[PDB]
Write a protein that binds this ligand. Structure first.
Ligand SMILES: Nc1ncnc2c1ncn2[C@@H]1O[C@H](COP(=O)(O)CP(=O)(O)OP(=O)(O)O)[C@@H](O)[C@H]1O
Length: 435
RNA sequence: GGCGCUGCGGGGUUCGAGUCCCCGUGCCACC
């Protein structure tokens, strides 16, 4: 249908209604009256300040501007005192900051330096006010275009730079809209993005570079898309193409996970002929920004072990539930032989040859292309037993918190027992199951 | 604090680690 009509109806799923605005407006006005009675310098930044927040994800952010005379730690806890005061519910989160609510509305209170211009950028937090200031006037009249882009990305699991997502940050979306002027223009052009595209908003041009790079108008040296993974960039370009090819309101609706019977899943695994198994361990008590990168690390390490040991892994995946974490793996080798070849020294190296042949072995060493070789015995013949051996000895390298939890307890789950665990969605995804 | 790319060292696997495995500036961090 008329693309213009799809986007008009898309505003509904994306723009917050009057009931949610006044909720926030009555929180904004009441938050200021409290901040003024104390007599502290503050500024309302963020997506709320620019009226670009997505429907459902309301959050009023306030930044406490302090003079740079009191440097170092001489202003951190001085802001925590003001936080709890104007807030109804204090609960510090981790550089510190205070999270809370004001008349039901979610709020953030953050301390940072006032600074001159964005040349004194040492602390990374001291950048948001400059970002806000750069966007405050340029985004005016395009708020809905920003909201459309966000909902589009949100509905396809690529909104937010947080490590659980590794997608497009809100700031990035606003810059993209300021650059192309609208959501529709962003999608049309994204179709021709490459892994080497450089979007320079301030200079108003597009170049070719070393990697995908969105120049921050505040700092030319920094990539606003720094944490946008290569695979999500790819997913987006493919999405934009699909959208223009055959527009649909569905691109703005979340996808329900693939519901599937454990028996069908077992029969699928049987047909693939692969080894499918999970590492299950207790979830560390840490925030998502720490957990997911560790889960990626543990996943990667084990996946590399599998390659080294010639179990030929296909893909990996991980899920975090309420109490446990799962590291999932699929491998082309269910079983490998006990014997393998170990490489001995060159034949003319008399000293080393003697040491190599001094070891006791079941079978005789042999010469091949000038070198000595010997048959020896693996310490495991299936990837499950391999990973069990590895997770026991190399727990330390599987992430700080993750690795420590694995050291205390883990278990390898495979077969039909695995299909009972809450990982069906992930197993379906990594195997590319469809229905 | 966690992860990532480098640099300098100490161990492990091995007949033999400049190389393989482990150990002692950037990103997300409310940027
Ligand atoms: N990765 C980043 N790079 C540069 N600036 C960022 C940034 N992340 C956040 N900011 C700044 O901090 C402000 C608020 O950050 P957040 O509240 O965490 C996301 P948001 O801008 O509120 O989007 P949202 O309300 O639609 O979810 C942003 O408006 C932006 O100015």
């Amino acid at each position: 249908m008329k693309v213009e009509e799809i986007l008009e109806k898309a505003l509904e799923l994306v723009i917050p209604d009057e009931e949610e605005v006044r909720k926030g407006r009555e929180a904004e006005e009441e938050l200021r009256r409290r901040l003024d009675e104390l007599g502290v310098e503050y500024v309302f930044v963020g997506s709320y300040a620019r009226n670009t927040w997505l429907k459902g994800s309301l959050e009023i952010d306030v930044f406490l501007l302090f003079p740079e005379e009191f440097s170092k730690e001489e202003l951190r806890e001085r802001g925590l005192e003001i936080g709890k005061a104007v807030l109804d519910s204090y609960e510090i989160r981790y550089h510190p900051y205070v999270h809370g609510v004001v008349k039901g509305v979610e709020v953030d209170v953050v301390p940072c330096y006032k600074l001159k211009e964005p040349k004194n950028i040492k602390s990374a937090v001291d950048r948001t006010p400059f970002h806000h200031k750069w966007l405050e006037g340029r985004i005016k009249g395009k708020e809905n275009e920003v909201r459309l882009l966000k909902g589009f990305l949100k509905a396809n699991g690529i909104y937010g730079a947080e490590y659980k997502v590794r997608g497009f940050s809100g700031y990035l979306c606003e810059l993209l809209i300021v650059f192309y002027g609208s959501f529709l223009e962003t999608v049309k052009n994204a179709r021709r993005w490459t892994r080497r595209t450089v979007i320079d908003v301030a200079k108003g041009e597009v170049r070719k570079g070393e990697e995908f790079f969105v120049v921050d108008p505040v700092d030319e040296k920094r990539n606003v898309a720094a944490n946008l993974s290569l695979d999500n960039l790819a997913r987006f370009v493919h999405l934009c193409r699909e959208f223009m090819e055959a527009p649909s309101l569905g691109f703005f609706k979340p996808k329900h996970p693939l519901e599937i019977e454990p028996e069908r899943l077992r029969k699928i695994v049987e047909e693939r002929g692969t080894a499918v198994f999970a590492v299950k361990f207790r979830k560390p008590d840490i925030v998502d920004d720490n957990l997911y990168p560790q889960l990626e690390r543990a996943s990667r390490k084990i996946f590399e072990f599998l390659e080294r040991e010639n179990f030929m892994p296909l893909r990996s995946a991980f899920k975090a539930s309420e109490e446990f974490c799962y590291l999932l793996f699929e491998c082309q080798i269910k079983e490998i032989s006990r014997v393998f070849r170990r490489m001995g020294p060159q034949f003319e190296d008399e000293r080393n040859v003697k040491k190599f042949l001094s070891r006791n072995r079941a079978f005789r060493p042999f010469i091949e292309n000038g070198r000595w070789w010997a048959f020896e015995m693996r310490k495991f013949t299936t990837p499950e037993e391999g990973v069990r051996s590895y997770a026991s000895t190399h727990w330390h390298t599987l992430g700080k918190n993750v690795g420590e939890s694995i050291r205390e307890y883990f278990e390898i789950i495979s077969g039909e027992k695995l299909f009972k665990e809450p990982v069906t969605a992930e197993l379906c995804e990594m195997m590319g199951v469809k229905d």
